Structure formats: structure tokens, C-alpha cells
Write an enzyme that holds these catalytic residues in place. Structure first.
Site, PDB file in Angstrom:
ATOM      1  N   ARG A 175       0.805  -1.237   0.000  1.00  0.00           N
ATOM      2  CA  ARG A 175       0.000   0.000   0.000  1.00  0.00           C
ATOM      3  C   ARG A 175       0.831   1.277   0.000  1.00  0.00           C
ATOM      4  NH1 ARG A 175      -3.458  -4.015   3.610  1.00  0.00           N
ATOM      5  NH2 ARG A 175      -4.836  -4.465   1.945  1.00  0.00           N
ATOM      6  N   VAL A 176       1.982   1.279   0.672  1.00  0.00           N
ATOM      7  CA  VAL A 176       2.891   2.441   0.777  1.00  0.00           C
ATOM      8  C   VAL A 176       4.273   2.231   0.154  1.00  0.00           C
ATOM      9  CG1 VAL A 176       1.624   3.424   2.711  1.00  0.00           C
ATOM     10  CG2 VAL A 176       3.546   1.912   3.203  1.00  0.00           C
TER      11      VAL A 176
END
Ligand SMILES: Nc1ncnc2c1ncn2[C@@H]1O[C@H](COP(=O)(O)OP(=O)(O)OP(=O)(O)O)[C@@H](O)[C@H]1O
Ligand SMILES: [Mg+2]
Lengths: 115, 147, 59, 116, 73, 269
Positions: free
Chosen positions: E9-10
């Protein structure tokens, strides 16, 4: 989702899209064991429109360009109805299924089909 | 950097992220996490390895591979094996997290591996059902999410 | 006929032209349809690819 | 354990490891403890670990164990098979088909496996 | 690693420039291969376009294979 | 909804799998029968080619139209592994080249799937026959062939080609198109006339190549069906395997719920 709130045209396009997907869901098991080729002429046509409708419901978001990199799209209610109404009527039966995936408006599917 | 082209090119991990390593038994879940710790022997990131409900022989083998690869001097190993008390297996991840937090609060970077978070949930379920606390889905306690 | 070999290329039915002539009219009869078209009907390649791809998924 | 301390390598045969799990379920119910998933005892993983962790290669000798395994309802995800498989280093499968061929050892070379 | 459902996600913001630029063409190749991998045995007679994608797909897959205790810089 | 429904579905898929297993072996047997019927027609074709060859050469004064400048074969049953589609995909490709070049095209349909492909697209036809036994006879093809030979004689057709799958191997059915029309030392005694005989031999040769084509396509139909029934059996197993995992989850979940209810009631009473 009521004719007295949104109008008959939008209500019919939605009722038609749902009717098409529902029948495709019912044919899933037969295609799973014998494939699409054993289906009736009309069923094969629906399975083809159901698949295009499925990918035309996909849309790149402006909060997802970081994940993917493609640019986001905003589609008006007018353009949304025109795209699905055209696929249900058969006006787009000559484009490949992959011309509808992540294309925002229907014109972009026509320009995506050129590749 | 985990040192694996597949992971570092398609599934990158950033400093401060929580990245789950999920799959069935005997597929390389520990292998991937131990190689990620070995690759930090020159990066400047201190590493911690928490073994929860594992066999003593499995824990001993991992420590030897870490020293054979030159990575044990940067690693802290926290062990709660399969024959130890359920209370110690349930608390080991919080003890290892506290040791890792020592570096994060002083402006440094650290990496923590929890070998089986599913074995911590089984240890906490045992303690909860022995205190007669009502069970939920798959017999786990109501606060299993919060654990 | 040859000095060494004799071949008999034998037919399996009366080859009277009338029989074949009837046979041809019988086949012509079976070929009659409600939508004969112009003779320039085409563009099936899209459908042929659509079914061909499904047949790949099947195996 | 006594023979291992003598300086030996020992074989420990357990007639059925599923019956060890069931005896623990029966005792746990008699003592009134609250049952766990699929009705097993809450102590299922600890009772298996207490037995299996003594079977190891020490610095004096080594106890190696051969354990017969039963699978409830042919389900490999059931808590008893699941817990036992976590402590197994090898799996030997004996085949009725191979026996008919005439190979008496009857170990299936394709289904049998080892972590070694 | 299953590139179909594995995701970070990051992670995008964490990659170095060299790996962030060069990795662009690796995940796409595995995706193109995902749709042809099983059918590949009878794809030697299909359109040249499909064959180019399949040739690349079989190569990229092979390259991602790596060994234990051997990290690359 | 629960474990009850999944058992019925696993039983339903297990029953269908056993018959598709047999149909693969039935198909293999029928494939071997159609392959011997293929070989019992080669002698009549190789010898007539030699006679039609030498007879023209010794009689150069006569040059039959067949010697100077589509029949499509389809199945009557389903279960084929896209065998009809693959040929129908080569029929459309060749027809395109002629539509681009500017020529018109007349068609002869043998079998049910050929008719379906043309009724579904409003295609033209000049002759048609179906329901031919898995064991066909040359006499049935005579009528359909005649509607095509006369065309070439009356100029209604400039070239004639046979479109059929070819039995490359047990695993391969190559779709192909070949031209039916147009096509030592000593010399033969001719009774009644050489010209009289050449006219008779050429019709026997075209009706022979058409029968060779139908029979080979039937062998292709059997092989294709064998692979399709193998695929169907394997696919059924995958569904059975997936459903069995869901059944085990439903089984384990039902037990935990009941125990909670028993414990809950006992903790009140
Ligand atoms: N890159 C690799 N090259 C070769 N073998 C590998 C590789 N990665 C993992 N393995 C092998 O995979 C096997 C299982 O690995 P590992 O024990 O780490 O998996 P695990 O999921 O943690 O298993 P467990 O559930 O017992 O903890 C080991 O034999 C290991 O050597
Ligand atoms: Mg491990």
C-alpha cells in the site's frame, strides 16, 4: 432506483444491465465444464455483451494513480447511460472485450480498440 | 531491501511499513523473512526475530544460519517455543516489539519479524477459554482483533 | 490391364446419370433457405476470436 | 529418554497419535474446561508440544519417532491433523495398489515426502 | 510470491529511482503471462503478437526465480 | 447456506465425471474405426491418378476443363474441441482474399454445424446434406458433388476447393483447404473412345477425393471429442476439490456453533 425519481431511460438501462449479468451468472457452471461453444446462439450473444458490460463498469480513480500510474476519470450520468445503452443495443459488438477495461467514457473504448 | 528481485521490484517494503507474509505450511515464509534480516547486516537497520510456538531445533537452526551468514551481531532473537507456557507465547511479540521500539524512539531504524502471529492467537485463545470468557467465530475471543 | 498387373476400379452403385441428377436436385432441395443473403456476408473474425479465446480457457 | 542419556540413538513408536489427542479431549471434558474449535480441548497445541518437544537430537543421544496418523473425516485442515503435521519431519505413505504389484515395503514414492 | 494478489500500500514511494523505473516492465510481463501460461503449449501456431508476449512472459518468470541465502544488491 | 446443499453438488459433479471418462475411451475406439476406413480408399485414388495422368498424356488433343485454368465438412454432434470453429475460421480467411480480389462465392454444406454457421449469418448455399452415418457412403455425396461439378462445366464456378480438417495426429487436427478443380513409355487400347473414358474417370476421381475428405474429418471429430471429454473430466475434479474444501469449512463451523449453544444454555440453567 425508481422510475418516478430517475426517469424511465436510466431505470431501463440499469434493469437491462442487471438482467444480462444475472443470466450470465446462471450459465457459469455449464461453461465451466463444457465451455462457451455448447450454448445457444442467443446465449452466446448475451455472454458476449455481459463480458463487455463487466469491463465497462471498471474505472481508473484519481486516488489510485499512485498505485497504478494511469490518470483518473470522472464520468457524467449522461455519458454513463449512453455507454451501457450502446453495448446492450449491440452498437459495439465489433470491439474486443479489452477495449472496454479502464476506458472511462465509451469514445475512449472506440479509441482503445484502434490498438 | 529484502534482496529478492521479485519482492524488491513488485512488492517493495518501506521503513515503518507493516508487510504481511501469508501462505500455507512449508512454502518459504520463514526463508523470506530470515533472508530479509540477513540483508540488513550492512544497511544500518537493527533486526529482531520473534519465534512464537516453534520447535526448539527450528529456532537453533535459524540462529546458526544467521551467524554463518554474518547477521547475528545485528539481530535480537526472542524465543517462546512449542512446549513453553501459553502466557509466554502470547507475550513474546510485545516484548520483541518493545526491544525494537528502543531504536525507533531515539531516531534509529529497526526491522521486526513475528514468525507465527497465528500461533500467538492460538495461545491467547487457550488463556481466554480457561478464564471462561465467551467465545466467538472459530472459538476465538472477542478481542482477538485488538490482540 | 498391364502385362504384369490387372486393376478393377469397381463402382459401388448404378452410375446412371439420372440417379446422380436426382441426387443433385435432392441436395439442391435441402440447400433452400429463408435468408439466402447477397453473397458478400463477412466480419465473423471478431466472433471467431471471441469463441477461440473461450476454447483456450476450456483446456 | 533413559537410553538416550546412556549414549544411544533410540526409536520411539507411538501406535496412534490421534488417540493421544482424543484422550486429552476426554480428560479436558471430565475436568469441566470450556471446549475450543471443533470441540477439541483448549490446551490442544500445548499438549502436543509437551510430548513432541522431548523427541530431539541432543548432545548425548537422539530419540527418533515413528507415529501412526489418523485423519478425521479425511479432512487435513481439522485441528488434530493440523497440529500434528506442524511437528512432522517426514511422511511415509503405504499404498494398497503398490502391494498388489508385489513390492512388499509398499511405500508410495510420489505421495511420501521428507523435509530433509 | 503470487504477483496477482500480493500488494504493498505504501511501497511505491519507498523504491529507489533505478528499481522504480526498471520494475515497470517486470510486473506487466507476469500479468501478460498469467493469461497465456496454461495455453502456451498450443500457442506456437497463434498470432505473432501473442508469441512475442508469451516469449517475454516465459523469460521474466524464469528471471524472478532466485535461491535461498543469496541476496542481490 | 450449509453443508446439506454442498453434498448434493459434489455428488452431481461426481456422476457426470464417470460418464465423460467412458466417452473418452468410446471416442478412442471410434477414432481407430474411422482410421481403417480411411486406409481402405487409398488404392482406388492412387491408381486412378496414374490412369488419368497417362491417359491425358497419350491423348493431348483432348484437354478436359478440370485439367486447365467451396465444399465444407462439419460434424452432426457436439462435444468437439472447437474443431468446427477452427476450420470455419480458415473458411472465412480464404473467402476474404477472394472478396478483396472481387470474386463471388457459392458453397456446399456437409453436416449440421455448417448449416448452423450459415443460418446464423444469412450465408448463401447451392447444395447441402447432413445426418450422414459415422460410417458414410460415397453415394450420398454424389448429389451434392454434382451440383458443384456442373457449375465448373457451366462456368458458374471458376475454381472448386474442399475445406476439411486433416488428421495430422491423435493430438492434432489441421484445418486445411485444397483445390479439387482444376487439377509411361507405352500406350493403352481404348474402348469405346479415349474422350468417352476421360469424362467418366474425372467424375470418379473428384467424388473419391470428397469421400476421402468426409471420412478423415469423422476421424478428426472422434479425436477432438476424446480430448474434450478428458478436459471435462479434469475440470469436474477441480470443482469437486474446491467444493470439498468448502464442505470441510461448513462441517467444522457447524460443530463450534452447537458447542457454544450447549455451553451457553448450561451456563444459565
Ligand atoms: N529460495 C529458496 N531456494 C531453495 N529452497 C528454498 C528457498 N526458499 C525456501 N526454500 C526451502 O523451503 C523449505 C521451507 O522453508 P521454511 O521452513 O522457511 O518455510 P516455512 O513456511 O517457514 O515453514 P514452517 O511452516 O515450518 O515454518 C526449506 O527446505 C527451505 O530450504
Ligand atoms: Mg517457519
Amino acid at each position: 432506483l425508481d422510475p418516478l425519481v430517475i426517469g424511465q431511460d436510466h431505470y431501463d438501462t440499469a434493469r437491462g444491465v442487471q438482467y444480462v449479468l444475472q443470466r450470465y451468472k446462471e450459465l457459469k457452471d455449464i461453461i465451466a465444464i463444457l465451455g462457451m461453444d455448447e450454448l445457444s446462439e442467443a446465449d452466446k450473444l448475451l455472454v458476449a455483451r455481459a463480458r463487455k458490460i463487466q469491463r465497462f463498469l471498471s474505472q481508473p480513480f484519481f486516488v489510485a494513480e499512485v498505485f497504478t500510474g494511469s490518470p483518473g476519470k470522472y464520468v457524467s450520468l449522461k455519458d454513463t447511460i449512453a455507454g451501457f445503452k450502446g453495448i446492450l443495443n449491440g452498437d459495439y459488438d465489433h470491439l474486443p472485450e479489452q477495449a472496454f477495461y479502464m476506458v472511462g467514457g465509451i469514445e475512449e473504448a472506440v479509441e482503445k480498440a484502434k490498438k | 531491501q529484502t534482496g529478492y528481485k521479485s519482492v524488491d521490484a513488485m512488492i517493495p517494503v518501506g521503513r515503518g511499513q507493516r508487510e504481511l507474509i501469508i501462505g500455507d505450511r512449508q512454502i518459504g515464509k520463514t526463508a523470506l523473512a530470515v533472508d530479509a534480516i540477513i540483508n540488513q547486516k550492512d544497511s544500518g537497520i537493527k533486526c529482531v526475530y520473534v519465534a512464537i510456538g516453534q520447535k526448539q531445533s527450528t529456532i537453533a537452526n535459524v540462529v546458526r544460519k544467521l551467524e554463518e551468514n554474518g547477521a547475528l551481531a545485528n539481530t535480537i532473537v526472542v524465543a517462546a517455543s512449542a512446549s513453553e507456557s501459553a502466557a509466554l507465547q502470547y507475550l513474546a511479540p510485545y516484548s520483541g516489539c518493545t526491544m525494537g521500539e528502543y531504536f525507533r524512539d531515539r531516531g534509529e531504524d529497526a526491522l521486526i519479524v513475528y514468525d507465527d502471529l497465528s500461533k500467538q492467537a492460538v495461545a491467547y485463545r487457550q488463556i481466554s477459554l480457561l478464564l471462561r470468557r465467551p467465545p466467538g467465530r472459530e472459538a476465538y475471543p472477542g478481542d482477538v482483533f485488538y490482540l | 490391364v498391364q502385362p504384369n498387373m490387372v486393376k478393377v476400379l469397381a463402382d459401388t452403385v448404378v452410375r446412371a446419370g439420372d440417379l446422380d441428377e436426382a441426387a443433385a436436385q435432392e441436395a439442391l432441395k435441402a440447400a433452400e433457405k429463408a435468408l439466402q443473403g447477397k453473397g458478400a456476408e463477412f466480419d465473423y473474425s471478431a466472433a471467431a476470436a471471441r469463441l477461440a479465446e473461450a476454447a483456450a480457457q476450456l483446456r | 529418554e533413559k537410553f538416550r542419556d546412556e549414549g544411544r540413538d533410540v526409536l520411539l513408536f507411538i501406535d496412534n497419535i490421534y488417540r493421544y489427542t482424543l484422550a486429552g479431549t476426554e480428560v479436558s471434558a471430565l475436568l469441566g474446561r470450556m471446549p475450543s474449535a471443533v470441540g477439541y480441548q483448549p490446551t490442544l497445541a500445548e499438549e502436543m508440544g509437551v510430548l513432541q518437544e522431548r523427541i530431539t537430537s541432543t548432545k548425548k543421544g537422539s530419540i527418533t519417532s515413528i507415529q501412526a496418523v489418523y485423519v478425521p473425516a479425511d479432512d487435513l485442515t481439522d485441528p488434530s491433523p493440523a497440529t500434528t503435521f506442524a511437528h512432522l519431519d517426514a511422511t511415509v505413505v503405504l499404498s494398497r495398489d503398490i502391494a498388489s504389484l508385489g513390492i512388499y515395503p509398499a511405500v508410495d514414492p510420489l505421495d511420501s515426502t521428507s523435509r530433509q | 510470491v503470487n504477483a496477482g494478489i500480493s500488494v504493498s500500500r505504501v511501497g511505491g514511494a519507498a523504491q529507489t529511482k533505478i528499481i522504480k523505473k526498471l520494475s515497470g516492465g517486470i510486473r506487466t510481463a507476469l500479468a501478460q503471462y498469467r493469461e497465456l501460461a496454461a495455453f502456451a503449449q498450443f500457442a506456437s501456431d497463434l498470432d505473432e503478437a501473442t508469441r512475442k508476449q508469451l516469449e517475454h512472459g516465459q523469460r521474466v518468470t524464469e528471471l524472478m526465480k532466485q535461491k535461498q541465502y543469496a541476496p542481490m544488491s | 447456506a450449509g453443508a446439506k446443499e454442498i453434498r448434493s453438488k459434489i455428488a452431481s459433479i461426481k456422476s457426470t465425471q464417470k460418464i465423460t471418462n467412458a466417452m473418452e475411451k468410446v471416442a478412442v475406439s471410434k477414432m481407430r474405426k474411422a482410421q481403417m476406413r480411411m486406409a481402405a480408399g487409398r488404392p482406388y485414388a492412387e491408381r486412378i491418378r496414374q490412369v488419368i495422368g497417362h491417359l491425358a498424356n497419350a491423348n493431348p488433343e483432348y484437354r478436359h476443363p478440370f485439367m486447365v485454368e467451396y465444399i465444407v465438412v462439419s460434424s452432426d454432434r457436439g462435444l468437439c474441441g472447437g474443431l468446427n470453429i477452427n476450420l470455419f475460421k480458415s473458411l472465412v480467411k480464404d473467402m476474404s482474399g477472394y472478396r478483396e480480389q472481387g470474386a463471388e462465392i457459392d458453397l456446399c454444406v456437409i453436416g449440421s454445424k455448417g448449416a448452423s454457421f450459415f443460418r446464423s449469418f444469412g450465408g448463401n448455399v447451392v447444395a447441402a446434406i447432413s445426418h450422414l452415418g459415422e460410417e458414410p457412403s460415397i453415394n450420398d455425396l454424389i448429389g451434392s458433388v454434382k451440383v458443384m461439378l456442373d457449375a465448373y462445366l457451366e462456368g458458374r464456378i471458376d475454381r472448386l476447393f474442399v475445406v476439411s480438417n486433416k488428421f495430422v495426429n491423435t493430438m492434432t487436427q489441421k484445418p486445411t483447404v485444397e483445390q479439387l478443380i482444376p487439377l509411361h513409355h507405352w500406350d493403352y487400347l481404348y474402348e469405346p473412345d479415349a474422350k468417352s473414358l476421360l469424362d467418366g474417370l474425372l467424375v470418379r476421381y473428384v467424388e473419391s477425393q470428397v469421400y476421402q475428405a468426409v471420412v478423415e474429418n469423422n476421424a478428426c471429430e472422434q479425436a477432438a471429442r476424446m480430448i474434450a471429454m478428458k478436459n471435462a473430466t479434469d475440470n469436474a475434479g477441480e470443482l469437486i476439490s474446491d467444493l470439498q474444501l468448502i464442505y470441510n469449512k461448513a462441517r467444522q463451523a457447524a460443530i463450534t456453533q452447537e458447542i457454544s449453544e450447549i455451553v451457553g444454555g448450561a451456563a444459565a440453567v
